[PDB]
């Protein structure tokens with residue numbers, strides 16, 4: 003019954019899912035070209 | 046590698062000196078820079094006949110040189126303080142902390 | 156810079172140099188807006204925190220940098236005419252096929268995909284398949300054609316190379332036109348003495364080599 | 374509906390080899406060696422570079438036919 | 448997760464019933480290989 | 492002959508080790524149905540199934556070097572090799588039955604897609620001749636198979652319960668008119684009564 | 688990558704000049720670097736091939752080519768004095 | 776170190792400075808390239824007319840008056856100067872600083888005699 | 890369908906079935922498929938792993954199987970950190986070399 007390093011397995015699976023989703027969706031690396039008209043300017 | 050290679054190797058001291066002088070220049074002589082950029086934007090002024098821009102370019106360069114050569118004693122003192130702070134910040138491999146903005150503002154107001 | 160649209164070149168004396176300037180100024184505003192949008196996106200992304208930003212700014216925002224370079228070069232060129240594309244066909248036979256996939260010049264229909272779909276439709280009609288199957292088998296090759304057509308960022312690199320070539324060619328052509336009157340007399344004298352059409356630079360390099368080889372040092 | 378989400382590993386892939394645990398150290402050694410080689414090559418290529426721009430960096434262009442590239446002023 | 452997607456497609460799509468458990472397993476293996484390749488390559 | 496020693500040791504180890512498991516794997520294969528006989532091994536636990544499938548060929552083909560074998564060891568290896576050959580034949584039989592089952596299930600799936608509620612585009616009132624001929628020949632082959640398994644009551648019962656299920660569903664999918672009496676003539680003898 | 692590192696990629700392409708040089712002196716330096724003399728067509732062949740053995744950075748290229756141009760200009764003046772006929 | 780605003784100010788200014796230096800380079804190069812083309816064209820015309828060389832198709836052949844060609848005189852004087860003043864240049868396996876010193880001394884020697 | 894098209898379709902499907910069967914059951918092709926199937930099974934179901942079912946009493950389990958995870962983490966972390974340090978050292982070396990060569 004005992005599973006060696008089960009917690010490590012859970013965290014590894016979670017990390018794999020997170021990384022794959024991050025790269026596939028690029029959720030964090032959005033595009034802001036659509037916001038440029040709605041932005042102020044300097045200089 | 047995808048990052049572009051370097052052309053001129055700048056010492057860290059030289060790099061900081063040029064960077065600070067550039068920040069000062071963009072305030073002191075923005076007019077000359079803007080005129081030069083305007084004259085270098087057109088096709089005729091950029092590629093075909095760049096010499097029509099030459100005079101403007103010269104003016105700009107002169108201004109920048111004048112900034113690079115700190116003439117006032119106060120300017121020299123402020124620049125040296127800012128440069129020393131920048132060197133200390135750069136050499137600090139340990140977790141970085143306070144910024145050098147105060148010295149830069151003091152220098153830009155000289 | 157907000158350059159005016161009215162070119163200041165004389166069309167009577169420098170026609171091509173005037174046309175180039177006119178097209179550049181005409182498209183400059185639009186390409187400048189696109190360039191500004193791209194640069195704003197780049198800097199705002201670089202302002203991010205950790206994975207959302209800086210930690211991976213330079214390396215993962217590659218398509219944006221490629222778009223920025225393409226936009227800058229195209230803005231400098233302004234407009235591209237088929238004569239120059241056919242000229243560059245020497246070194247890249249697929250220049251038109253690559254320059255169509257980089258710029259929004261004309262609408263591209265997956266004609267090969269649609270032809271394969273029609274062939275599958277004929278097959279199904281012969282073998283009496285349900286119409287849903289043949290509509291799906293028409294969509295599928297079309298989808299494959301579209302997938303293999305769009306994207307293709309290598310075509311953008313080839314477009315950049317072609318645009319660099321075209322800019323150099325246009326600059327040299329402008330220099331030719333500007334000094335054409337000055338060289339009229341020398342040209343008239345030269346054509347009557349040299350029966351070759353090879354360039355002066357090539358002939359002079361060959362002459363220099365000939366001197367370096369055969370001429371006595373003395 | 375039935376709840377099914379979970380982070381636990383599946384028992385189908387949890388078996389060991391006869392002689393002990395799965396070949397983890399043996400494969401990690403190979404992975405580390407490959408990473409060392411790859412990153413060493415990348416670093417060596419990246420850091421030892423400079424851009425030298427002078428007349429000697431330019432050569433005469435040519436077509437895919439090998440002839441010299443020249444375009445008329447048509 | 449993958450199992451659940453396959454289960455939904457099997458239970459809702461009549462055509463998908465044509466696939467054996469063996470073909471489903473082959474798709475599973477290919478998908479795992481592609482996921483590993485994606486994870487590895489994105490960091491290169 | 493060091494390479495011969497290693498080859499023979501590898502063969503002995505793998506073959507003898509798997510021979511002790513062939514009973515379990517074959518029993519498990521029998522336990523499941525014919526739709527996916529290896530379902531348990533793909534989903535729950537691969538009890539040395541792929542190992543048996545791979546090493547059966549090696550047992551059949553790869554040569555042996557008796558001088559590297561003992562007396563009792565050689566007898567044991569021959570016994571294990573025979574067991575692996577038996578497993579090969581058993582797997583072939585199960586595969587044949589499974590593919591026939593999938594033939595019948597393909598026919599049923601076509602009918603079901605025909606009568607599906609979402610099928611707003613390919614709704615047919617009257618069964619066409621091609622599928623009728625396919626049904627007739629499939630049922631003929633199924634009856635012949637049932638006859639051929641008269642010496643194996645368990646196998647015959649399993650074949651009925653598994654394959655004839657979709658024959659019964661096909662029976663239920665259509666009305667009792669047209670050519671129905673002729674198409675299901677063989678099925679009406681015994682099988683139809685079983686599926687009531 | 689923080690701006691402190693990126694700015695290095697905009698500082699690298701700037702040639703280093705003494706801060707006490709007026710713009711006109713810099714432009715004169717560029718003119719001398721790009722000067723043209725007929726004799727170059729030969730001396731260059733004997734110069735560039737050599738410099739490939741020493742150039743590793745842009746500053747080395749600048750210095751070596753500028754010295755080559757200076758030598759070639761002096762040689763051109765000497766040759767013009769020697770052979771006035773070809774230059775009348 | 777400095778706020779991002781100042782960093783972008785520096786970036787813009789440095790871009791402008793690099794463009795200015797490129798402007799100097801472009802001006803000088805265009806002027807000297809025009810001069811070079813004129814000189815080379817004139818030299819080829821004089822060579823062909825003088826009978827020094829024969830230019831046919833894509834090939835230059837030695838004429839009967841080859842010894843009088845101006846380019847021949849230029850080559851001979853280049854050899855003369857590389858011998859008298861810039862001696863040892865062909866094979867000088869010294870340090871970079873040594874090479875710079877050698878070039879400077881050769882320049883001084885040429886200046887003195889000119 | 891039309892009985893002529895029926896003949897054509899039956900012939901075509903028979904040809905497809907025969908081609909598939911021949912390609913799969915040909916001697917060399919059969920051997921290739923048979924070996925590759927087992928190789929794929931080994932790769933998929935016996936890939937390196939850090940979590941596994943422990944069915945042995947603590948007295949009958951090796952130390953390697955209690956510290957394999959820690960050894961793997963040590964190896965990977967050490968590799969990453971050492972590569973980072975090597976990158977920094979190479980940066981410094983290149984900077985110093987090209988500085989001492991000129992400017």
Ligand SMILES: CCCCCCCCCCCCCCCCCC(=O)OC[C@H](COP(=O)([O-])OCC(O)COP(=O)([O-])OC[C@@H](COC(=O)CCCCCCCCCCCCCCCCC)OC(=O)CCCCCCCCCCCCCCCCC)OC(=O)CCCCCCCCCCCCCCCCC
Nearest residue numbers: 011014383386400403404479483929932936938939940966
């Ligand atoms: C023709 C043949 C047939 C073809 C068929 C078609 C398809 C192709 C098939 C080809 C065969 C191979 C396919 C790939 C493998 C598929 C595996 C699979 O599906 O398993 C599912 C199966 C799913 O099971 P599950 O129940 O869902 O559980 C999964 C969970 O993730 C549970 O996971 P877990 O918990 O067990 O973890 C797994 C384990 C796995 O990892 C390992 O152990 C492996 C390590 C890497 C080894 C790499 C070796 C590579 C060697 C290459 C050599 C060169 C090859 C060149 C070949 C050339 C050609 C000959 O992870 C770790 O070890 C985690 C390490 C984390 C490190 C963290 C670092 C911390 C640093 C900080 C330290 C502390 C600092 C403190 C500071 C404090 C400050 C205050 O996976 C597993 O169970 C196994 C684990 C996953 C393994 C993935 C391996 C992927 C490999 C891809 C290779 C692609 C190569 C392409 C080459 C192309 C060349 C042209």
Ligand SMILES: CCCCCCCCCCCCCCCCCC(=O)OC[C@H](COP(=O)([O-])OCC(O)COP(=O)([O-])OC[C@@H](COC(=O)CCCCCCCCCCCCCCCCC)OC(=O)CCCCCCCCCCCCCCCCC)OC(=O)CCCCCCCCCCCCCCCCC
Nearest residue numbers: 285287288290291295298459460461462463604607609610
């Ligand atoms: C822009 C980039 C490129 C985009 C395109 C990329 C395409 C990539 C390749 C796609 C390959 C698909 C085919 C292979 C997969 C398996 C197919 C299969 O089972 O084969 C046999 C199966 C036929 O079985 P059957 O025995 O003939 O049917 C009786 C069975 O009982 C039926 O039993 P069953 O349960 O098996 O049948 C369900 C069947 C579905 O088939 C059906 O039974 C019916 C299909 C038609 C339904 C039409 C709507 C019905 C009314 C619903 C209410 C709509 C209201 C709209 C207005 C609202 C106003 C507020 O489900 C599927 O087809 C499964 C896959 C569906 C998704 C993938 C295909 C997406 C195609 C999207 C483009 C379609 C063309 C453009 C349309 C628009 C033009 C302006 O499927 C086919 O042979 C047909 C394939 C689908 C053809 C297109 C039909 C329209 C689908 C629209 C979906 C839109 C989804 C939303 C997102 C769209 C994003 C683009």
Ligand SMILES: CCCCCCCCCCCCCCCCCC(=O)OC[C@H](COP(=O)([O-])OCC(O)COP(=O)([O-])OC[C@@H](COC(=O)CCCCCCCCCCCCCCCCC)OC(=O)CCCCCCCCCCCCCCCCC)OC(=O)CCCCCCCCCCCCCCCCC
Nearest residue numbers: 389390391392396399487542924927928931932935936937
């Ligand atoms: C590295 C660079 C070079 C790579 C070359 C690869 C060449 C592959 C060619 C394959 C040809 C067909 C093979 C057919 C099978 C023949 C052998 C056999 O039956 O097994 C005998 C033997 C024992 O089998 P068995 O008795 O049936 O045991 C299983 C039973 O369940 C009984 O189990 P048990 O409980 O009794 O325990 C027995 C135990 C006994 O096992 C052992 O004793 C083996 C333990 C490991 C090796 C130990 C020795 C280490 C030192 C070797 C030194 C060699 C020096 C060579 C020098 C050459 C000089 C010229 O078995 C195992 O545990 C099996 C281990 C399976 C490992 C599979 C690894 C999958 C992942 C690979 C990629 C990972 C990438 C990670 C990247 C991640 C990045 C984040 O197993 C093996 O030989 C294992 C081979 C596993 C790998 C084969 C496939 C590799 C594919 C790599 C991906 C390439 C993709 C490229 C793209 C695709 C197009 C090209």
Ligand SMILES: CCCCCCCCCCCCCCCCCC(=O)OC[C@H](COP(=O)([O-])OCC(O)COP(=O)([O-])OC[C@@H](COC(=O)CCCCCCCCCCCCCCCCC)OC(=O)CCCCCCCCCCCCCCCCC)OC(=O)CCCCCCCCCCCCCCCCC
Nearest residue numbers: 019023026027029374375376377378448449451452453455
């Ligand atoms: C012109 C532009 C047009 C654009 C649009 C064009 C059309 C696009 C396609 C549209 C069609 C897509 C169809 C997808 C269907 C997926 C299956 C489904 O509907 O689920 C039913 C089924 C329902 O199960 P159930 O048992 O009824 O659930 C009830 C239970 O009580 C539930 O049990 P429980 O309560 O215990 O569960 C707890 C809960 C635990 O979770 C929660 O409670 C909440 C979790 C919140 C997560 C928030 C994430 C936030 C960060 C990411 C955000 C990204 C987007 C936004 C970014 C900006 C804003 C931030 O578990 C879940 O929520 C399970 C699912 C979520 C797991 C988390 C990871 C999901 C992402 C996986 C990777 C995706 C990679 C995509 C790559 C695509 C490549 C093409 O769910 C599943 O099947 C589960 C597994 C699904 C795996 C999908 C993996 C990706 C598949 C990619 C290929 C798909 C091809 C499709 C055909 C294409 C055409 C031929």
Ligand SMILES: CCCCCCCCCCCCCCCCCC(=O)OC[C@H](COP(=O)([O-])OCC(O)COP(=O)([O-])OC[C@@H](COC(=O)CCCCCCCCCCCCCCCCC)OC(=O)CCCCCCCCCCCCCCCCC)OC(=O)CCCCCCCCCCCCCCCCC
Nearest residue numbers: 494497498501548552553554916917918920921924925928
């Ligand atoms: C581009 C990248 C490429 C590389 C990466 C690829 C990645 C993707 C995966 C690719 C997977 C598919 C591969 C292609 C399919 C190949 C099919 C095939 O072989 O067809 C034969 C097969 C005929 O054989 P058969 O019908 O199975 O056998 C009956 C015959 O009458 C013959 O009867 P026989 O008794 O006269 O001869 C039997 C034997 C020849 O017999 C011998 O002479 C002895 C051979 C060795 C036996 C095993 C001794 C193991 C001793 C321990 C070693 C320990 C090493 C260190 C580790 C220790 C700790 C674990 O010949 C074979 O059948 C050779 C088959 C391949 C090797 C099988 C051995 C596997 C285990 C040993 C290697 C792996 C390491 C395991 C380590 C761990 C072990 C616990 O069909 C054909 O003839 C087809 C020909 C046309 C297709 C292409 C043929 C290619 C041939 C390649 C030969 C490679 C030899 C090994 C090279 C090793 C270099 C280091």
Ligand SMILES: CCCCCCCCCCCCCCCCCC(=O)OC[C@H](COP(=O)([O-])OCC[N+](C)(C)C)OC(=O)CCCCCCCCCCCCCCCCC
Nearest residue numbers: 456458459460461462602603604605606607608609610611
């Ligand atoms: C780019 C293309 C985009 C196109 C977009 C198209 C969107 C399609 C959305 C489809 C939704 C789902 C239904 C179709 C697919 C069903 C698949 C499936 O598995 O179902 C099988 C099952 C049917 O099969 P079954 O029930 O026989 O189940 C199978 C059983 N055996 C195996 C025994 C045969 O479900 C259905 O198909 C249900 C269909 C329901 C239809 C409901 C229609 C509602 C219409 C509303 C109109 C509103 C108009 C408002 C106007 C207002 C004006 C003011």
Ligand SMILES: CCCCCCCCCCCCCCCCCC(=O)OC[C@H](COP(=O)(O)OCCN)OC(=O)CCCCCCCCCCCCCCCCC
Nearest residue numbers: 014015018019022380381382383448449456478479482483
């Ligand atoms: C009608 C329309 C019909 C449409 C049908 C379409 C069908 C498509 C089916 C295929 C696509 C399915 C996609 C599923 C979502 C992706 C999930 C994902 O990324 O993980 C995949 C898999 C684990 O997920 P899963 O197997 O689903 O769940 C297991 C639960 N225990 O992960 C794997 O097994 C991949 C292997 C790696 C797993 C992670 C390993 C540990 C992570 C750390 C590795 C460390 C490596 C070394 C160190 C690196 C860092 C220093």
